[PDB]
Amino acid sequence: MGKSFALLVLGAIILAGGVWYTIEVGYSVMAIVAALIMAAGGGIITWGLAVAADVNSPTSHKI
Amino acid sequence: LAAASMETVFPLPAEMVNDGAEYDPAKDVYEHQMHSVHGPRNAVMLIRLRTADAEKVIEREGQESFHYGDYYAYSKICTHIGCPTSLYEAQTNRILCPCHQS
Amino acid sequence: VTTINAIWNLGPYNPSQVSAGSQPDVYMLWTDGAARVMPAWELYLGNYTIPAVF
Amino acid sequence: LGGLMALLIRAELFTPGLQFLSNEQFNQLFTMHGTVMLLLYGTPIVWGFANYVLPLQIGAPDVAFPRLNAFGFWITTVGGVAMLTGFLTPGGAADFGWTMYSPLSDAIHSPGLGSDMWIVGVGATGIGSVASAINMLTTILCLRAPGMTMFRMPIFTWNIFV
Amino acid sequence: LLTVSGGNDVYAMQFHVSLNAMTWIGRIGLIVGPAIAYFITYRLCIGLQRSDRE
Amino acid sequence: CEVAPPGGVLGDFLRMGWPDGITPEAVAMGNFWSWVWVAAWIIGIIMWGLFLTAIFAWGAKRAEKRGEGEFPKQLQYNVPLELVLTIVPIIIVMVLFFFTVQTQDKVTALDKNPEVTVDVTAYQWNWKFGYSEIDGSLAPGGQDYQGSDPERQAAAEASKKDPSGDNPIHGNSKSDVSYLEFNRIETLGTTDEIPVMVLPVNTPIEFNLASADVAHSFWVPEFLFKRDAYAHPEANKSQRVFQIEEITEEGAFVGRCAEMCGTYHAMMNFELRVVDRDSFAEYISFRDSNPDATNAQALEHIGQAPYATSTSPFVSDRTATRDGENTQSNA
Amino acid sequence: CSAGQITQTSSQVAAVDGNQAGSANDPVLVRDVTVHLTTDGEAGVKFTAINQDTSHTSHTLESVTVDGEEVELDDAEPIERNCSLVADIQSELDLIEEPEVGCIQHVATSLENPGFAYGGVVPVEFVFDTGAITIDATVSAPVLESGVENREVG
Amino acid sequence: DDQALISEGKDLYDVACITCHGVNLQGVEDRGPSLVGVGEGAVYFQVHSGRMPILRNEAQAERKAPRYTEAQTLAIAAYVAANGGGPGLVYNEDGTLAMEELRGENYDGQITSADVARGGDLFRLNCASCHNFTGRGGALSSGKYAPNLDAANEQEIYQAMLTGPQNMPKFSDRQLSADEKKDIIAFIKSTKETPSPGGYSLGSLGPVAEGLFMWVFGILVLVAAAMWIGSRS
Amino acid sequence: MKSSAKLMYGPTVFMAAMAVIYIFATMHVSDGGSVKGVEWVGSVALVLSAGLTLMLGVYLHFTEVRVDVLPEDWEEAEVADKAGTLGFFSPSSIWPAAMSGAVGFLAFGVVYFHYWMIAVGLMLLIFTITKLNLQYGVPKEKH
Amino acid sequence: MLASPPLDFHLADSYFLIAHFHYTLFGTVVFASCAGVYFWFPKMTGRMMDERLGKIHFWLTFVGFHGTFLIQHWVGNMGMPRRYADYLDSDGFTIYNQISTVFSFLLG
Ligand code: HAS
Ligand code: HAS
Ligand code: HEC
Numbered sequence A: 001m002g003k004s005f006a007l008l009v010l011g012a013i014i015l016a017g018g019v020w021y022t023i024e025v026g027y028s029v030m031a032i033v034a035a036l037i038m039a040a041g042g043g044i045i046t047w048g049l050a051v052a053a054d055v056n057s058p059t060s061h062k063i
Numbered sequence B: 001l002a003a004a005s006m007e008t009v010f011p012l013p014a015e016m017v018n019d020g021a022e023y024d025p026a027k028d029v030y031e032h033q034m035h036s037v038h039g040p041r042n043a044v045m046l047i048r049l050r051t052a053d054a055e056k057v058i059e060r061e062g063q064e065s066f067h068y069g070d071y072y073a074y075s076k077i078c079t080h081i082g083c084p085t086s087l088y089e090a091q092t093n094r095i096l097c098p099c100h101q102s
Numbered sequence C: 001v002t003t004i005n006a007i008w009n010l011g012p013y014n015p016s017q018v019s020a021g022s023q024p025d026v027y028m029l030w031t032d033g034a035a036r037v038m039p040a041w042e043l044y045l046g047n048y049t050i051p052a053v054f
Numbered sequence D: 001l002g003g004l005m006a007l008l009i010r011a012e013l014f015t016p017g018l019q020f021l022s023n024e025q026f027n028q029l030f031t032m033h034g035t036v037m038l039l040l041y042g043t044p045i046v047w048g049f050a051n052y053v054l055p056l057q058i059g060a061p062d063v064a065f066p067r068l069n070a071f072g073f074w075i076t077t078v079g080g081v082a083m084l085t086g087f088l089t090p091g092g093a094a095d096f097g098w099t100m101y102s103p104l105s106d107a108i109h110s111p112g113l114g115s116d117m118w119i120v121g122v123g124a125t126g127i128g129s130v131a132s133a134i135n136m137l138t139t140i141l142c143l144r145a146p147g148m149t150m151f152r153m154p155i156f157t158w159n160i161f162v
Numbered sequence E: 001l002l003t004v005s006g007g008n009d010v011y012a013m014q015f016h017v018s019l020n021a022m023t024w025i026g027r028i029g030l031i032v033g034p035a036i037a038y039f040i041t042y043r044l045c046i047g048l049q050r051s052d053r054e
Numbered sequence F: 001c002e003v004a005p006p007g008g009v010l011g012d013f014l015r016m017g018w019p020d021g022i023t024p025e026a027v028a029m030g031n032f033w034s035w036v037w038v039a040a041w042i043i044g045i046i047m048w049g050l051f052l053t054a055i056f057a058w059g060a061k062r063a064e065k066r067g068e069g070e071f072p073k074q075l076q077y078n079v080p081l082e083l084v085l086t087i088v089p090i091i092i093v094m095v096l097f098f099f100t101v102q103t104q105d106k107v108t109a110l111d112k113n114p115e116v117t118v119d120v121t122a123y124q125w126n127w128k129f130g131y132s133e134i135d136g137s138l139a140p141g142g143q144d145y146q147g148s149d150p151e152r153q154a155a156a157e158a159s160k161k162d163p164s165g166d167n168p169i170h171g172n173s174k175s176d177v178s179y180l181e182f183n184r185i186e187t188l189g190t191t192d193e194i195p196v197m198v199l200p201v202n203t204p205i206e207f208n209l210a211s212a213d214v215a216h217s218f219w220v221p222e223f224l225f226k227r228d229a230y231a232h233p234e235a236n237k238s239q240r241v242f243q244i245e246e247i248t249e250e251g252a253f254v255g256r257c258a259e260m261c262g263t264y265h266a267m268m269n270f271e272l273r274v275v276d277r278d279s280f281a282e283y284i285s286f287r288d289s290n291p292d293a294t295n296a297q298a299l300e301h302i303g304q305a306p307y308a309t310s311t312s313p314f315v316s317d318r319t320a321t322r323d324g325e326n327t328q329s330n331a
Numbered sequence G: 001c002s003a004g005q006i007t008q009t010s011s012q013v014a015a016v017d018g019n020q021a022g023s024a025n026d027p028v029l030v031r032d033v034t035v036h037l038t039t040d041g042e043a044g045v046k047f048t049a050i051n052q053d054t055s056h057t058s059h060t061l062e063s064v065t066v067d068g069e070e071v072e073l074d075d076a077e078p079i080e081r082n083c084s085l086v087a088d089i090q091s092e093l094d095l096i097e098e099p100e101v102g103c104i105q106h107v108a109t110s111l112e113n114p115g116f117a118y119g120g121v122v123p124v125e126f127v128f129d130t131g132a133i134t135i136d137a138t139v140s141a142p143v144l145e146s147g148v149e150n151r152e153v154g
Numbered sequence H: 001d002d003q004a005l006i007s008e009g010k011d012l013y014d015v016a017c018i019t020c021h022g023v024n025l026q027g028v029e030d031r032g033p034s035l036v037g038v039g040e041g042a043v044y045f046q047v048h049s050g051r052m053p054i055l056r057n058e059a060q061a062e063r064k065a066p067r068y069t070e071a072q073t074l075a076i077a078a079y080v081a082a083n084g085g086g087p088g089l090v091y092n093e094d095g096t097l098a099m100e101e102l103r104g105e106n107y108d109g110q111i112t113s114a115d116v117a118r119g120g121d122l123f124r125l126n127c128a129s130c131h132n133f134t135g136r137g138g139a140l141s142s143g144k145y146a147p148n149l150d151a152a153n154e155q156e157i158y159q160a161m162l163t164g165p166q167n168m169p170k171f172s173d174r175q176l177s178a179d180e181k182k183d184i185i186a187f188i189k190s191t192k193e194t195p196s197p198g199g200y201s202l203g204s205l206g207p208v209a210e211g212l213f214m215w216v217f218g219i220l221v222l223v224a225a226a227m228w229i230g231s232r233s
Numbered sequence I: 001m002k003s004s005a006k007l008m009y010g011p012t013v014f015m016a017a018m019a020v021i022y023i024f025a026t027m028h029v030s031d032g033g034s035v036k037g038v039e040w041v042g043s044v045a046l047v048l049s050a051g052l053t054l055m056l057g058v059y060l061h062f063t064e065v066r067v068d069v070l071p072e073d074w075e076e077a078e079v080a081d082k083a084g085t086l087g088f089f090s091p092s093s094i095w096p097a098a099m100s101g102a103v104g105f106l107a108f109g110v111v112y113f114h115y116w117m118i119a120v121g122l123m124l125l126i127f128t129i130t131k132l133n134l135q136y137g138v139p140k141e142k143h
Numbered sequence J: 001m002l003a004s005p006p007l008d009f010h011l012a013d014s015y016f017l018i019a020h021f022h023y024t025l026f027g028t029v030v031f032a033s034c035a036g037v038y039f040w041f042p043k044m045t046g047r048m049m050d051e052r053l054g055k056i057h058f059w060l061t062f063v064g065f066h067g068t069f070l071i072q073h074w075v076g077n078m079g080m081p082r083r084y085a086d087y088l089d090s091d092g093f094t095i096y097n098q099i100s101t102v103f104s105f106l107l108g
């Protein structure tokens, strides 16, 4: 529920943008940056999952 | 000089030379020679390079033919404030001035 | 009890020779340090030049 | 600070070939990552939580030796900065792993002052830890609240005692 | 900073910090270090007079 | 162990990435590892289940919806169950230690009767192998081959004292090298070539480790074993000899250094090449007969790769390696 | 910062007059190639040809020349893998011992001086059975027996 | 005698130096230079002072506790000399390496002060720019430095001048002849081994040491005296 | 301080027993994969670790036989029992930071091994320690 | 598993050891120190931490950690030693290091 959908979807392409670039460039310095893009995508994925976790089971009830 | 070596040289006019085959034991040239050593602006670093390093020299426009083989000869007086430079790094090939680290 | 300015091992002055540690006295080191930290900005104007030490 | 070095290690091991580190820099990186993470993060965070929580749990106003506790804090930070000063050396910091096995740490086999700075940074940290421990024993032995027998203490302060 | 930049030839030789690093420490420090000094000194003075009032 | 793993995909999972191994004690270590992993998986799942039960079953919202109230039973002590749960790990680690002692002792025992003994020298940063003794079956001469070089080892024994006299370390010179064995048949590892030690199949083999410089370690992943090589192993009270009952299959196998020795610790690879027993006699007779010939020439004489096929030498340039092609073309 | 991939201690070459050719990947290397010309006028070519061909294709120095001019050298054995043919003028070659252990061999050289100048640089062309190697080398005097010579004014 | 010494030289060389210098002294691509033609003196200087082996690529190699003794050093030098020769060690009149007999052109049993004068002017001309007036060392670019000369013996000084170890220029025996080199050794040892007449030397680093001493501790003690004599309010 | 004085007897006896067991073990067991012979490192450490814990335990017990029935140890004590002065505690002091800096200077001195740094560090260290120990007893300003 | 010698002969000083002590240290120190910070932030400050940011932090650290270090058991077993700065393409453990690195950046 909530932002978790979009925050996941925004990540799912960025992660796809990362790994693709990783399989494009050879072993090089830019492969490091490709790894960083891929990991940023994974982080936004988990960020979406964690806001979903908070929405499913709130523990700070009153805003 | 051997390769990658340095020596400070001064101007020595032919008249005030008393060495070699011309050596006269009773010719007092010391005063003028020392008077040439103590000139403010006439000490020059003569540098013999390695052949490998003489390949990658860049010549200045107009100073094309100044070298004589491996031998180059720069002025020892720093262009900043005029301390003797005198710190010739034999591998990095950087002449260094101790006064302010040029 | 402490030696200061042991001139006898410096030798007489001649303009072709210099040492690695050749700083001025302590109270002048500030005006040495300025000359060490200036980034070599020098002006050329036709027949004239303002050196980097101005 | 240590985790940044860890990430540099991982970035270098992402693919074969030395992309941006050398062998020497990689060695120094894992050495200093291990040292700072074990000795500058772990033991100081242990003693920090001990210092805050233990007097509240045992019902005391203050630790047994306050100035000794402050000395422990400051000497630990001094040791940390000494340990990290090795990177300012042209040759870099220590490079022999956080264990510092010999003969690799000998004068023959480990020149450069970074190898020495490790030794002092660790030592300054170690006495900082000891100065923190002197309190926690003496505090529990001497400043407990009325009615708080030894076996009514919380488990945390038991662990800190041991 | 001006003084120790004047003496950095000796400082780098003794304490084993690179001579270029010393010149750049002098350069960037003559901007940055004064600001840090001002900040810390100001806050410490305010803390001192707060202890007096306390 | 004498009992083999479950096998199949379960064995592959329990393996879990170990090499299969090429010696008897490698098989023993692998089997023990597989069954220990079985027991570990049992414990892991049977406690992750309880944590999951806490996550899903013992939640507060469920019990409050059920009407349990604001608090649970407030139980603190169950002494008999506590004593039982204390006794359980005691027995588990005890019965584990029994098989640990069994497998460890059959691994480490130095009674395997070597036919070949190879002296190994570790140095910063490469390996040097030297055949120390060979049984008469494999030796060129019919009688047992002994490889210690008299003049070069005499120099080693003479290095112990009196370089015009320093003798600080217990009366010996600080640069003593009398603990190193110098042999006349030697393979010398270089940055231009990965050294290759040639061994036969199905013979008890012995390794005698030592180190010119800082401590190293000899690790062959296919032996599932590694041992530290120290300078002056007798002075360290370190056991410098270890024996393998045999190698069971031919092939080329990489071996690495597993001890942090210095800058080029990663570059210190070697290869262990196991060859048909009949070909080993040809190899040793070739190396003995014309010692000027290199190791690669002997390997050609066998009829196999002159250079280590398992690992190629690293590129020694610190800039060329950026694009990931850090491998030197041996030929 | 000094321990990076570009390092000052790593880029250094030997403090010798002799140039050098060949990478670690090349089959045959020439180290310390120099044109010697003693004060007495005699001359020659100092060098060391090291064989490291992983194909084990043992070579034989067919010829060496300085600016196309011949240099005399004889009795050069083939150089199999991991072997060094050290060449120098006979007077300097006599100063060092031939090693009975190891593959090294010593060979003498001599060339007629066409008028080479001390300080300058001249090409040197080696040709072995497997190919030719070209390298510029400087001209200088041999090293004195250390400690014997004083500065003499006349 | 040398023929059997070369064997120990080879055995020691194979077990330490190959990783940087190759089996045939050809060098390695970025890991170490070629050692063809360096000679006995370079090996003696590098090993006896303990600079070699270098276990870390750095701005500069470091002196340290030597990994080999004297006889092993001469053995390795003999092995390297067999590959092309080079500058040689200064052997005395009986065959031992010259120590204490290099202290001046006119050495008899004590340092002659005329040699000390000439060597002082020579050292100020050539050596004192990278080192300092009395050889206390100095700094260079990008983390390199000129060491303090108090550690070396006379043979090490001579071979240092002869070989030009890393960034030091070579001083061949026809640029600085043996008389000049021995006078330089005499001046170095005189400055090393003579106490300062004017009390504690402060390291002879020059104005920096004197400044630091006074401007910190000398003024601190006098403000302490002032606090003794004055009041805090 | 009764319970903590007496609970230290378990660790010390365990360490002592392990020390003697280990000394006999390493001096007798000629197992393969290891070298027979007593090792002094480790055995010395075990015996002096037992020594540390025994020193703590014996001093605490020797003290505790003197003290009375303190209310913190009385299982049914009231908050009024401990009313009075708890003791003297330092409110504030700059000297811990000062002597930490002094130790840092001394440590840096032994890093580079400049002898003047070691001497000045030791002098500064004893100065800062003395100023720490005399903080609450410096005389009033003598007019 | 590391405690038994016959397994330690292969496991010692490999990436298996790395994964083991990172599991124990990152669990006992990082996870539980964060637990302590969240637990005693009220008592240490008089304020309560943001719950949502806490859950985000936890899930990021958890998934990044297990991604980083669970796969290093396999490279340790396959033969990669600890403290290795460079490795060959032919060794056979480049993909596992790549998987480790991406989740390591997630940990960062
Ligand atoms: C906070 C930091 C650490 C903790 C905690 C820790 C816990 C253990 N470690 Fe460790 N570790 C080793 C063994 C253990 C054992 C037995 C435990 C214990 O705490 C484990 C007990 C914990 C449990 C959570 C037990 C399971 C729980 C339950 C409830 C069941 C009870 C047990 C049963 C039933 C028996 C298991 C049953 C089976 C069937 C297997 C060994 C060797 O036996 C090495 C050296 C290896 C080498 O060759 O270098 C080692 C290496 C290290 C290093 C190496 C650093 C370096 O080399 O530079 C570090 C920093 C480290 C940290 C830490 N380690 N450890
Ligand atoms: C408490 C103990 C430890 C913790 C926690 C720890 C955390 C990590 N470790 Fe580790 N470590 C490795 C990877 C990691 C990674 C990726 C993390 C992660 O926790 C790191 C991520 C966490 C971070 C926290 C960094 C993020 C930083 C950011 C995002 C920004 C930086 C910028 C600023 C401005 C910071 C803000 C500053 C302010 C003042 C606010 C690896 C391999 O991937 C090896 C073996 C490598 C080899 O070949 O030997 C290793 C080696 C060791 C060793 C052995 C060293 C030796 O053998 O000599 C030890 C004892 C150890 C302990 C510990 N390690 N580690
Ligand atoms: C790398 C692991 C090395 C080992 C082992 C040894 N040396 Fe070395 N050497 C190395 C480097 C990086 C350099 C260049 C930097 C420098 O300090 O000059 C050198 C240099 C030398 C030289 C100087 C040559 C010259 O022309 O002056 C010599 C004479 C030398 N090395 C000899 C030597 C010997 C005999 C060694 C084993 C006994 C030895 N070195 C070890 C790196 C390494």
Ligand code: HEC
Binding pocket: B087, B088, B089, B090, H049, H051, H060, H061, H062, H063, H123, H126, H127, H128, H129, H130, H131, H145, H146, H147, H148, H149, H150, H151, H152, H156, H157, H158, H160, H161, H165, H166, H167, H168, H169, H171, H184
């Ligand atoms: C700067 C260009 C230098 C000049 C001019 C001279 N030397 Fe030097 N020297 C220099 C360096 C960078 C080094 C270190 C070399 C290394 O590999 O570490 C040295 C070293 C010496 C030594 C050895 C000192 C030691 O502790 O072992 C000696 C004895 C020495 N130098 C003497 C010396 C003399 C007598 C000089 C004038 C003729 C001279 N050097 C010039 C840099 C420079």
Ligand code: FES
Binding pocket: B078, B079, B080, B081, B082, B083, B097, B098, B099, B100, B101, B102
């Ligand atoms: S006098 Fe040369 S840099 Fe200033």
Ligand SMILES: [Ca+2]
Binding pocket: D011, D012, D013, D014, D015, D016, D017, D018, D019, J086
């Ligand atoms: Ca890489």
